[PDB]
Amino acid sequence: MPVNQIQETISDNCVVIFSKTSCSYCTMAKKLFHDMNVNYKVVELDLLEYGNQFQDALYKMTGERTVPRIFVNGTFIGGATDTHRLHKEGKLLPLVHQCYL
Ligand SMILES: N[C@@H](CCC(=O)N[C@@H](CS)C(=O)NCC(=O)O)C(=O)O
């Protein structure tokens, strides 16, 4: 069940980016975490056999189906635009640090 695997992945990784391989928003979100020296897990929905079902479950969980859907410490933070805003505000690295602490 995709909803289970989603929950498993976000619980087992500090940062998860549900992504597609040719999405410019996703590339930007990867770039942001990379530039912060934060390790992330990428799930490429376009390469998964049931990625459509994953995208459905991400809609049900988060309220929207667009990629990227980004989780930090098991908490949905937004898409690419939200993540950049949270980073600009100094809200993102504290969430990353809760993970470890
Ligand atoms: N406002 C969103 C924009 C994301 C977005 O529009 N993503 C496109 C892919 S580039 C999308 O998900 N399109 C529909 C789809 O692939 O299902 C964000 O900042 O994350």
Curated annotation (Swiss-Prot):
Modified residues (S-glutathionyl cysteine): C23
UniProt-annotated binding residues for [2Fe-2S] cluster: C14, C99
Positions that bind glutathione: K20, Q55, V67
GO annotation, biological process: apoptotic process; cell differentiation; cell redox homeostasis; DNA protection; glutathione metabolic process; regulation of DNA-templated transcription; regulation of signal transduction; response to redox state
Keyword vocabulary terms for this entry: 2Fe-2S, Disulfide bond, Electron transport, Glutathionylation, Iron, Iron-sulfur, Metal-binding, Mitochondrion, Nucleus, Phosphoprotein, Redox-active center, Transit peptide, Transport
Regulation: The 2Fe-2S present in the homodimer leads to inactivation of the enzyme. The 2Fe-2S may serve as a redox sensor: the presence of one-electron oxidants or reductants leading to the loss of the 2Fe-2S cluster, subsequent monomerization and activation of the enzyme. Unlike other glutaredoxins, it is not inhibited by oxidation of structural Cys residues.
Tissue: Widely expressed. Expressed in brain, heart, skeletal muscle, colon, thymus, spleen, kidney, liver, small intestine, placenta and lung. Not expressed in peripheral blood leukocytes.
Disulfide bridges in this chain: C23-C26
GO cellular component terms listed in the entry, alphabetical order: intracellular membrane-bounded organelle; mitochondrion; nucleoplasm; nucleus
Keyword hit for Phosphoprotein: yes
Subunit structure: Monomer; active form. Homodimer; inactive form. The homodimer is probably linked by 1 2Fe-2S cluster.
Record-stated family: Belongs to the glutaredoxin family.
Record function comment: Glutathione-dependent oxidoreductase that facilitates the maintenance of mitochondrial redox homeostasis upon induction of apoptosis by oxidative stress. Involved in response to hydrogen peroxide and regulation of apoptosis caused by oxidative stress. Acts as a very efficient catalyst of monothiol reactions because of its high affinity for protein glutathione-mixed disulfides. Can receive electrons not only from glutathione (GSH), but also from thioredoxin reductase supporting both monothiol and dithiol reactions.
Record's miscellaneous remark: The absence of GLRX2 dramatically sensitizes cells to cell death induced by doxorubicin/adriamycin and phenylarsine oxide.
Protein name in the entry: Glutaredoxin-2, mitochondrial
Organism: Homo sapiens
Lineage, highest ranks first: Eukaryota, Metazoa, Chordata, Craniata, Vertebrata
Gene behind the chain: GLRX2
Range within the parent protein: 56 to 155 of 164
